């Protein structure tokens, strides 16, 4: 197996409550060991391991490097957030909501597929005859498709009575009002 030597540099920005809290963390990484860090809360380079000590001391001795890094939370993070506000943070893709019955016979499982939505924040609930079901609900984790959409499968273990209406109920920032999709038991299982 060929040997490989890897370097990573990550200029990371953290935002909370709009730009009320903004934090820059610059990370230099050898293979998977973070070795040097610039955290705007700290205001100087810090050696995370011994391998990063010479770089941290050397960069901290360079006044021009320090003041650029210290301004970078505004110059980079806050500047780019204004662009995100007009683009990524405005991205609304409404979820597609689909119910299909399954087994694990007669049907004893319903799968609510909630697909192709953005952003990630979502609330999916199962109702049976207008009463929220809590037991018997199993969800996949939030699934990242990689194309700026997510999906999630929320499953309900069920023993259906003929006439029962099972409702998948989805809340999402793209929606003025929840999506509800109904599955109506046509027989008793």
């Amino acid at each position: 197996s060929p040997e490989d030597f890897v370097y990573q540099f990550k200029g990371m920005c953290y935002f909370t409550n709009g730009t009320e809290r903004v934090r820059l963390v610059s990370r230099s990484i050898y293979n998977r060991e973070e070795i040097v860090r610039f955290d705007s809360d700290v205001g100087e380079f810090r050696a995370v391991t011994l391998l990063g000590l010479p770089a941290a001391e050397y960069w901290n001795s360079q006044k021009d490097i320090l003041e650029r890094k210290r301004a970078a939370v505004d110059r980079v993070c806050r500047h780019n957030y204004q662009l995100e506000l007009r683009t990524t943070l405005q991205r609304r893709v409404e979820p597609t909501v689909t119910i299909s019955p399954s087994r694990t016979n007669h049907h004893n499982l319903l799968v609510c597929s909630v697909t192709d939505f953005y952003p990630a924040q979502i609330k999916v609930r199962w109702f049976r005859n207008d009463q929220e079901e809590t037991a018997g609900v199993v969800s996949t984790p939030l699934i990242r498709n990689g194309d700026w959409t997510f999906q999630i499968l929320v499953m309900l273990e069920m023993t259906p009575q003929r006439g029962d209406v099972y409702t998948c109920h989805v809340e999402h920032p793209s929606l003025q009002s929840p999506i509800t999709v109904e599955w109506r038991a046509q027989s008793t299982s």
Partner: T-cell receptor, first 106, second 112 residues
Framework: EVEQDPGPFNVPEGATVAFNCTYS??????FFWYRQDCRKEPKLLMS???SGNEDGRFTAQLNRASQYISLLIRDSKLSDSATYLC?????????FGTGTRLLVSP | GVTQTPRYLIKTRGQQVTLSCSPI?????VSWYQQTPGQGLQFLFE???????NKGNFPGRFSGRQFSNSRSEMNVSTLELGDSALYLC????????????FGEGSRLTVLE
């Protein structure tokens, strides 16, 4: 781990005093001497550098090869009587030494 | 410099106490340390931007907080005899600084 001269220094006024301190973590980044009068608060005395920080009667120096930190007090005054703390900063840990007490007699 | 109140306090075992620290104007990091004979300086908790940034090894009856003016409070919900100490706060402009400015401390004596 920070280890200091483990005992009271009883020194006549005017003598020159050497404090020593060792640290075990090679990754330790910054180093300081603090000064603390009896039952009072610590006060930053000086940062420590490999060149040797010099400021009046005080000199502090770092040796990364041996992982030693030192403080020199030339021409000691009665007012130098205090507990001298070696303070070592590593990644997310600032460690205060237990201190070396210095008593300057007239 | 750094202002701490109350400067002296007598409490009894089982009581609660709140100590207050006003850092140097402009400083945003406040740390609390406990000073006893025989252990020296022990780090309680550091507070930056109104949240606890780092924590020492003290039990949970020791708690703290930081307000939006960077003033900080320390609390012990239930005091023990061995909590008698000089409680020192230290401020620095930025987080995780080795360059600290200490108040004069709150001298707390806990009696039965």
């Amino acid at each position: 781990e920070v280890e200091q001269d483990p005992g009271p220094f009883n020194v006549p006024e005017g003598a020159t005093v050497a404090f020593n301190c060792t640290y075990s973590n090679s990754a330790s980044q910054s180093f300081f001497w603090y000064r603390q009068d009896c039952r009072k608060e610590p006060k930053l005395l000086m940062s420590v550098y490999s060149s040797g920080n010099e400021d009046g009667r005080f000199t502090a120096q770092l040796n990364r090869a041996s992982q030693y930190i030192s403080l020199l007090i030339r021409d000691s005054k009665l007012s130098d009587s205090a507990t001298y703390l070696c303070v070592v900063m590593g990644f997310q840990k600032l460690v205060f030494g237990t201190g070396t007490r210095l008593l300057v007699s007239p | 410099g750094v202002t701490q109140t109350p400067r002296y306090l007598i409490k009894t075992r089982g009581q609660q106490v709140t100590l207050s620290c006003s850092p140097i104007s402009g400083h945003r990091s406040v740390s609390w340390y406990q000073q006893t004979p025989g252990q020296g300086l022990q780090f309680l908790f550091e507070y930056f931007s109104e949240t606890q940034r780092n924590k020492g090894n003290f039990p949970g009856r020791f708690s703290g907080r930081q307000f939006s003016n960077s003033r900080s409070e320390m609390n012990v919900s239930t005091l023990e005899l061995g909590d008698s100490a000089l409680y020192l706060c230290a401020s620095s402009l930025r987080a995780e600084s080795g360059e600290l400015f200490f108040g004069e401390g709150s001298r707390l004596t806990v009696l039965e």
